[PDB]
Amino acid sequence: SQKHLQINQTFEELRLVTQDTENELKKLQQTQEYFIIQYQESLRIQAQFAQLAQLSPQERLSRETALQQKQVSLEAWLQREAQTLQQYRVELAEKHQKTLQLLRKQQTIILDDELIQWKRRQQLAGNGGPPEGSLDVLQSWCEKLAEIIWQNRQQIRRAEHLCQQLPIPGPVEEMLAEVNATITDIISALVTSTFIIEKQPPQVLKTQTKFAATVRLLVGGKLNVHMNPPQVKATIISEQQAKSLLKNENTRNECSGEILNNCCVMEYHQATGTLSAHFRNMSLKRIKRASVTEEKFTVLFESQFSVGSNELVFQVKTLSLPVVVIVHGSQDHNATATVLWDNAFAEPGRVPFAVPDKVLWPQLCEALNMKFKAEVQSNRGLTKENLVFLAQKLFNNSSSHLEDYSGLSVSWSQFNRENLPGWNYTFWQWFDGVMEVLKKHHKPHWNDGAILGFVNKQQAHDLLINKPDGTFLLRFSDSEIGGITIAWKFDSPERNLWNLKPFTTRDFSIRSLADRLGDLSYLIYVFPDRPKDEVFSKYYTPVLAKAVDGYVKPQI
Numbered sequence: 001s002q003k004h005l006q007i008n009q010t011f012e013e014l015r016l017v018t019q020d021t022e023n024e025l026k027k028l029q030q031t032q033e034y035f036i037i038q039y040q041e042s043l044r045i046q047a048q049f050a051q052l053a054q055l056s057p058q059e060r061l062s063r064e065t066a067l068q069q070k071q072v073s074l075e076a077w078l079q080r081e082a083q084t085l086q087q088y089r090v091e092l093a094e095k096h097q098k099t100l101q102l103l104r105k106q107q108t109i110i111l112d113d114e115l116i117q118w119k120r121r122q123q124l125a126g127n128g129g130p131p132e133g134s135l136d137v138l139q140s141w142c143e144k145l146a147e148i149i150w151q152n153r154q155q156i157r158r159a160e161h162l163c164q165q166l167p168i169p170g171p172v173e174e175m176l177a178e179v180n181a182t183i184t185d186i187i188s189a190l191v192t193s194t195f196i197i198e199k200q201p202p203q204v205l206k207t208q209t210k211f212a213a214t215v216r217l218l219v220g221g222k223l224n225v226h227m228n229p230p231q232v233k234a235t236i237i238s239e240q241q242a243k244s245l246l247k248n249e250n251t252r253n254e255c256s257g258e259i260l261n262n263c264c265v266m267e268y269h270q271a272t273g274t275l276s277a278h279f280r281n282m283s284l285k286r287i288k289r290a291s292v293t294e295e296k297f298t299v300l301f302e303s304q305f306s307v308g309s310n311e312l313v314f315q316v317k318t319l320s321l322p323v324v325v326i327v328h329g330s331q332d333h334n335a336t337a338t339v340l341w342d343n344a345f346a347e348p349g350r351v352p353f354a355v356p357d358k359v360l361w362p363q364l365c366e367a368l369n370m371k372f373k374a375e376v377q378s379n380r381g382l383t384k385e386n387l388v389f390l391a392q393k394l395f396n397n398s399s400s401h402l403e404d405y406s407g408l409s410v411s412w413s414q415f416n417r418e419n420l421p422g423w424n425y426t427f428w429q430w431f432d433g434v435m436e437v438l439k440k441h442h443k444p445h446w447n448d449g450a451i452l453g454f455v456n457k458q459q460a461h462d463l464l465i466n467k468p469d470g471t472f473l474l475r476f477s478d479s480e481i482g483g484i485t486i487a488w489k490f491d492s493p494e495r496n497l498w499n500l501k502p503f504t505t506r507d508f509s510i511r512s513l514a515d516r517l518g519d520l521s522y523l524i525y526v527f528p529d530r531p532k533d534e535v536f537s538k539y540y541t542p543v544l545a546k547a548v549d550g551y552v553k554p555q556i
Contacts, residue, residue: 004137007114010106011144017099018151021092025155028088032162035081042078045071086168089159093175096156100182103148107186110141111193116348119196123321126203127343127367128374135198135274139218142194143273146222149190150308153183188314191307194218195316198276201299203339204332205323207287213279215301215318217266220275223307226268230305232277234262236284237300242319242352245300256297257325258285266303277301287325293334296322296342296353322353333436337416337428340371358409361391368431375435378447382454389454393420394427425481433482441508442484450474450526450535457487461497463527464489470524474513477502484513490522514539 045067052064115138122132156179163172199214213234220226236257237245244250260283268275289295299320306313322342324335344367345355365387373381382390384402391405392398394414399405416428423430434453438446445451451474455463464471469490477483483502490498503516514536517523526535545555 007106007109007141010102010109011141011148014099014102014106014144014148017095017102018148018155021095021099021155022151024088024092024095025159028085028092028159029162031081031088032085032166035078035085036166038074038078038081042071042074045074082168085166086170086172089163089168089172090170090175092159093172093179096152096159096179097175097182099152100179100186103145103152103186104182107145107190110138110145111189114138114141115193115196120348122200123343123346124370126200126321127340128371135196135216135218139216139274142190142218143222145190146219149183149186150223153187156180156183187307190219191223191314192316195301195303195318197301197318197320200321201282201323203321203323203343204326204335205284205297206326206329206332207284209283211282211284213282213299213301213320214276215266215279216274216276217303217316220266220268221273225305225307226266226275229266229268229275230303232264232266232279232301232303234259234264234279234282235300235302236287236323237298237319238288239296239298239322239353242298242300245317246319246352255300256288259283259299260285277303284325287327291334292326293324293331294338295324296338297325298322298352319352333429333432334416336432340367341412341415343367344370355412358411361395361405361408361410364410364415365390372435376438376446377443380447380449386454389456389459390431392456393430396421423478429481434476437482437484437505437508440505442513444539445474445513445536448535451484452527455487457499460487460499464497467528468525470522471527471529472523472525473527480504486517486520486523488523512539512541515541 048067049064049071052060052067118132118135118138121130124130125132156176160176163176195215195217197213198216199212201211201213205211215232217225235253235255236259237254238256241254241256244254261279261281264277264279266275266277287297301318301320302316304313304315322339324338326332326335341359342353342355345359345363347354347356365382368390369382369387373379388400388402388405391402391408392400394410395405395408397405414427416426419426420430425433438451438453442451446453452460453474453476455473455475457475457478460473460475463473464487467489470488472486472488475485475487477485480502481504483504485502486500488498488500489496503513507516517532517536518540523532525531542556545551
């Protein structure tokens with residue numbers, strides 16, 4: 001990538017300029033150390049002048065004349081060397097300022113762009129999107145960031161020790177203070193921003209259920225944090241508790257529940273360079289409340305460690321993605337809508353768990369399609385026709401062009417609070433019910449194209465009207481949540497177009513969809529013309545004989 005080629009090129013130039021100032025600070029220390037030896041030679045002349053002055057002025061003229069000439073020329077050398085020493089100091093501080101300003105630009109490319117890109121990619125992965133990918137390139141860049149910032153911090157601290165050994169008043173003191181303020185900002189932003197969650201806890205979290213999380217410190221190895229790995233503490237915080245924690249109005253260490261097995265020491269893995277805390281056996285013992293399915297929480301991960309020096313301790317805190325705590329698993333369906341809306345429509349740099357009330361229809365389409373393919377585990381997602389059917393259902397409109405629904409808005413209540421115009425359910429309750437019946441039993445049938453699904457009673461009437469007798473299609477029931485209805489054509493004296501009574505998961509548990517279809521002889525061709533046995537025969541149950549009937553070896 002061109003962006004990735006630029007980041008690596010900038011690290012190579014930051015590596016060079018850190019060595020340029022390293023070689024200059026060694027020269028500066030040598031110039032100062034040599035200057036100090038010559039200043040003591042200046043003191044030796046005065047000691048020799050007083051030792052000669054006590055004696056008579058006979059042969060004293062010869063010795064005290066050459067000494068005067070020596071003293072005068074040494075004092076001129078010292079006066080020019082002091083200017084050189086000040087010049088080198090200003091030039092070193094100028095180079096340090098130049099490398100730290102380039103460093104700030106590189107730190108902002110990786111921490112405010114590339115890391116945000118990854119965190120967002122991980123947030124959508126909670127909704128069924130593409131995997132966020134490994135933290136390997138981000139760790140190899142943060143290690144280089146820690147390597148360069150620490151080298152420059154050590155160089156400026158050696159430079160200050162030279163200044164305290166031989167102080168020269170001037171602009172250097174303000175430059176050194178300005179450079180010191182810059183490295184503490186770069187060190188805090190790097191440290192506080194690289195304590196991240198690699199593996200998020202389940203966003204629909206049930207009480208008394210084991211769960212896992214993984215927290216990584218990207219600058220672990222390169223800042224000697226792994227010398228004595230810190231203890232990380234998982235604590236469940238509410239939405240209001242997270243607003244105050246981030247707006248510094250935390251006051252006391254607040255919490256809204258108990259997490260069993262919440263203390264974990266970080267583990268350094270050699271031949272990877274990763275410092276991570278794997279919480280594998282966490283469990284939510286209790287939860288504090290004040291609907292349940294709309295109530296958001298977060299897993300707060302706190303740690304405290306000293307970087308390099310003993311007197312440089314950071315208190316890191318990272319918030320997990322919003323978590324909805326359910327108590328009976330029946331609430332899993334309504335909680336999923338809160339998580340889906342949050343993951344999909346969260347704005348960057350937001351106040352804890354602030355989502356938009358209204359969203360545009362194509363935005364909701366992207367989220368629904370993403371979740372759908374992930375639940376039914378199929379590459380066959382929602383086609384342009386499937387999306388039009390959902391818009392027709394949601395907005396109560398008869399338009400068959402997706403472009404017409406582009407500028408329409410869907411509020412959160414229109415999605416999962418208000419029931420559909422003439423129904424006892426919400427749009428999400430219907431869509432999620434379709435995903436629930438497809439995922440529970442019909443994952444292969446959906447992938448095979450056997451279930452048309454997103455077609456209404458009148459649309460299916462007009463698809464089959466002029467087809468041969470026995471043509472049928474599987475459709476989603478409008479009256480029964482999570483129901484599949486067969487629509488078939490068969491010329492008869494009363495009606496020619498029919499709709500069979502819907503089946504739900506309970507029915508499918510007693511007899512599979514294929515077994516049910518195989519019994520009905522008036523179902524001959526699956527729409528538009530594929531013979532029934534070609535589509536479903538692989539799924540028919542072979543009648544196995546029993547041992548109680550008297551069969552020693554398995555028989556069909």
